[PDB]
């Protein structure tokens, strides 16, 4: 029987690069929104300046029943410092033009993300969400925001 | 900027 929980495509490449975008990335270049994907083995995506205005988007391209997240920190591959999300806010959209933050009761969803820069933190929605557009955005970290993302849900 |  099929279940509506499947990797959407950051690990496969389903989910093509021109889908990844950011509010911004590190000035060097080495840390892309590109380098997002869950087991990316080069860094991962770093904002330019450590702040909770931060995010990382994905374009699903269609409306698309999402379920859960899952996240990564990184090792510098330059440095062997690890960065990682320790918790976030998630945003989505049907159009990429009205956001709304994701709730859980009156207030938003502070997801607990990472304790690590190296294995998975799976989070699982409260109710699956139909969204076209996703939103990751870090409150807090350790030492600085890095992250690599799968997403899991269903193409309805 | 620095190299992380």
Known sequence: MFQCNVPLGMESGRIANEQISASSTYSDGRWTPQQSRLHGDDNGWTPNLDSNKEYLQVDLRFLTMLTAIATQGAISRETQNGYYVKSYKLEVSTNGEDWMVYRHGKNHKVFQANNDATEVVLNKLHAPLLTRFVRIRPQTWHSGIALRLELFGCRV | ?4
Do not use: N
């Open chain 2, 1 to 4: 900027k620095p190299r992380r």
